């Protein structure tokens, strides 16, 4: 039954990613003045089915490789991260209840940094190597920030079990005692998913594409667990799963919606902005969220 | 280089060495050795020539692998009877690995291959500070953990370091290599009497540090690399010559002079045991490492090499180097002969 649980987690990820491709194309089309894709059947779900199976059909990139084994070894790592990163995420009952899951989140984000760096070295000549090197730099510069902010928002709750998080979100949303910290965290999720307004300007393109969008849905689900949501009365998990899905969908639409209308940043502006504006502000919020639970007589019941 | 940054780096060298002196935990000793390395790396490469860069590379590799083998010895110590008290160890194997780690830390005969190479391509200040604190820092640790060491380790490294610093040493006119081979021979001496009475080891450490400070201060008074430059220092000034005479003869250790006092007390409290052939072998090699001192003195102050003009030009400028503290260290280092019962000032 446990392998049935694993397959019921990792079978709908292909459905979710392909339908996310049609949803991002349609939503960008209606932020723009475009209808479609809707000639390919009714509103185009067979359109992601069709282009996915087309890219499977289409003849691969000829090598042109260096260590064929290494070249296959990078995207296999990217996709197995994208699969193995929905294990401790609680919608009401997670797959594995852990003592700690958030450090596992940050560690697998660093393994995604490994995926980028290995594909960049094993790819090609020197210019793509320089481009992927800048990409690894602008990816690695934010795991300071996101881990710092995630630490300061769990410090209100003391424990790492994350079912204690779904307990402690019962009264108010956690956006209210930490709005700027959550806002900076959301900007860091835009950084980790490596999308607009942040620049990145391969093979297999579908697998790197899959890792991208599963990373996005991963960060959205972790956001929806982490900062908002509602209660969970037991012996009825459909209620929390509905409210969780609706809030995560609204947040992912907001994510692509923020992507839709902003130009890409200059690179030295990106590093300058991150260090000299997020890093003292994260330290300020950390020291205040340390010194405040010792003030207000509320240190969490870390069992 | 900023002077604030140099004061900070000196503060961290002093902090690391004082942490090695003062702590009772093994992790803190390892932290002190590592921080001593990390701080002493940018004292070298004080200029930007590639000589200092390769010297710092060799030094970093040997120093880091010594540090990690020391950590291996400590984790063996807690694989056996486990507590973090600087005391008698609980394994001959762990003590073997630990004394070989410290033998890499401070100048020993199988491990001395980095010492002349690290001293040749660096300026004088970096060589002075590395010899002083990198031969002071492990001696406290060995003074601590002496009661659980197989003696053949320490005695083999001491004998072989004295004879290597002897025999290697007859061939170099690079003065940094001369002082480095002298450091190897004296560290063999200062390690030899560790298991009999360590008061002699620490007094020999004091005398050696003061002697090397006098010698390197005399070289910093007028920048030389070879003996011919010392003959030009004979031409330009006479008092530096008699200082080179007295300090080289006190490195030689003659009984009218204060460098003999560390040899003689070693021979005393070594021969109150049943060790006689080992003292006469060590003191024959102490006669051996005086020969390059003596040919250096013959090159400097007693015979005279032909000189070059523009020394005529340098006559019109009186000396304007600052010495850190040369004369106090000199007469503390050389006229200390009737103060032998300042032996017991130490323990």
């Amino acid at each position: 039954m446990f392998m049935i649980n694993v397959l019921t987690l990792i079978i709908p990820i292909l459905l979710a990613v392909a339908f996310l491709t049609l949803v991002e194309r349609k939503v960008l089309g209606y932020m723009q003045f475009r209808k479609g894709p809707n000639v390919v059947g009714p509103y185009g779900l067979l359109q992601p089915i069709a282009d996915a199976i087309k890219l499977f059909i289409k003849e691969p990139l000829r090598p042109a490789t260096s260590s064929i084994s290494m070249f296959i070894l990078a995207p296999i790592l990217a996709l197995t991260l994208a699969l193995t990163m929905w294990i401790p995420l609680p919608m009401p009952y997670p797959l594995i209840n852990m003592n700690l899951g958030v450090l596992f989140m940050l560690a697998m984000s660093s393994l995604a940094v490994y995926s980028i760096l290995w594909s960049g070295w094993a790819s090609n000549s020197k210019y793509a190597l320089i481009g992927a090197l800048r990409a690894v730099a602008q990816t690695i510069s934010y795991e300071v920030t996101l881990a710092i902010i995630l630490l300061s928002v769990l410090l209100m709750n003391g424990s790492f079990t994350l079912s204690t998080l779904i307990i402690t979100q019962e009264q108010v949303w956690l956006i209210f005692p930490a709005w700027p910290l959550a806002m900076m965290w959301f900007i860091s999720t835009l950084a980790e998913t490596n999308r607009a307004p942040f620049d990145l300007t391969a093979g297999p393109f579908a697998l790197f594409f899959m890792a991208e969008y599963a990373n996005i849905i991963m960060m959205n689900i972790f956001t929806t667990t982490l900062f908002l949501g509602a209660f969970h009365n037991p012996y009825m998990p459909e209620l929390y799963t509905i409210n969780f899905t609706i809030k995560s969908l609204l947040l992912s639409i907001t994510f692509l919606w923020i992507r839709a209308s902003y130009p890409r940043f200059r690179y030295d502006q990106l590093m300058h902005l991150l260090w000299k504006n997020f890093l003292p502000l994260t330290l300020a919020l950390c020291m205040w969220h340390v010194s405040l639970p010792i003030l207000l007589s509320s240190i969490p019941p870390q069992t | 280089m900023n002077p604030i940054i140099l004061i900070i780096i000196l503060m961290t060298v002093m902090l690391g060495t004082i942490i090695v002196m003062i702590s009772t935990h093994w992790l803190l000793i390892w932290i002190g050795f590592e921080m001593n390395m990390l701080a002493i790396i940018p004292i070298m490469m004080k200029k930007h020539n590639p000589r200092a860069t390769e010297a710092s590379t060799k030094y970093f590799l040997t120093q880091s692998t010594a540090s990690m083998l020391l950590m291996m010895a400590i984790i063996i110590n807690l694989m056996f009877s486990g507590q973090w008290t600087v005391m008698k160890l609980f394994n001959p194997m762990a003590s073997m690995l630990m004394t070989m780690a410290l033998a890499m830390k401070l100048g020993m005969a199988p491990f001395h291959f980095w010492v002349p190479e690290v001293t040749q391509g660096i300026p004088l200040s970096s060589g002075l500070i590395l010899l002083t604190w990198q031969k002071l820092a492990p001696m406290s640790v060995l003074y601590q953990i002496l009661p659980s060491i197989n003696l053949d380790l320490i005695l083999t490294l001491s004998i072989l370091s004295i004879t290597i610093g002897g025999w290697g040493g007859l061939n170099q006119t690079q003065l940094r290599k001369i002082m480095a081979y002298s450091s190897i021979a004296h560290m063999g001496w200062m390690t030899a009497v560790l298991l009999y009475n360590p008061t002699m080891t620490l007094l020999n450490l004091i005398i050696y540090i003061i002697m090397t400070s006098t010698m390197f201060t005399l070289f910093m008074a007028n920048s030389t690399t070879t003996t011919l430059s010392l003959s030009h220092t004979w031409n330009k000034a006479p008092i530096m010559t008699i200082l080179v005479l007295i300090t080289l003869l006190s490195m030689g250790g003659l009984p009218p002079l204060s460098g003999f006092m560390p040899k003689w007390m070693i021979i005393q409290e070594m021969t109150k045991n049943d060790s006689i052939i080992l003292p006469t072998l060590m003191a024959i090699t102490a006669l051996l490492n005086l020969y390059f001192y003596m040919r250096l003195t013959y090159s400097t102050a007693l015979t005279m090499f032909p000189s070059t003009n523009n020394m005529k030009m340098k006559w019109q400028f009186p000396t304007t180097k600052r010495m850190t503290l040369l004369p106090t260290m000199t007469v503390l280092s050389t006229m200390l002969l009737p103060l032998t019962p300042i032996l017991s000032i130490l323990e």
Binding site: - | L27, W30, I31, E34, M37, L38, I41, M45, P50, R51, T53, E54, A55, S56, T57, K58, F60, L61, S64, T65, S67, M68, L69, M71, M72, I75, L78, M79, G82, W84, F113, P116, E117, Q120, G121, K177
Partner: protein, 98 residues
């Protein structure tokens, strides 16, 4: 004797011989130093866990962070050597002869 300790000590000797004999690149030597570091980490951590040595359980993480910043210094030194030369071989260092 908790048999796994034999294998981790043999792994330490593996990493130590890999640190000592090394042919061409200094980066392999530094990475085997890091492997030796990991070996000491794991060995001491299993010892402290099975001892229930619960007061001073700081040794794994603090040994880790110190020898990690050692590896950082080694990276900077290797970058400086590779900056003033073309490559970072063990060769092209035979200047400053002993």
């Amino acid at each position: 004797m908790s048999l796994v300790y034999m294998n981790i000590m043999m792994a330490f000797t593996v990493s130590l011989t890999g640190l000592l004999m090394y042919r061409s690149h200094l980066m392999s030597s530094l990475l085997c130093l890091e492997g030796m570091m990991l070996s000491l980490f794991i060995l001491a951590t299993l010892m402290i866990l099975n001892s229930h040595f619960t007061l001073a359980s700081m040794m794994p993480i603090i040994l880790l962070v110190f020898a990690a910043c050692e590896a950082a210094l080694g990276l900077s030194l290797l970058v400086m050597v590779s900056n003033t030369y073309g490559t970072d071989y063990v060769q092209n260092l035979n200047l400053l002869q002993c």
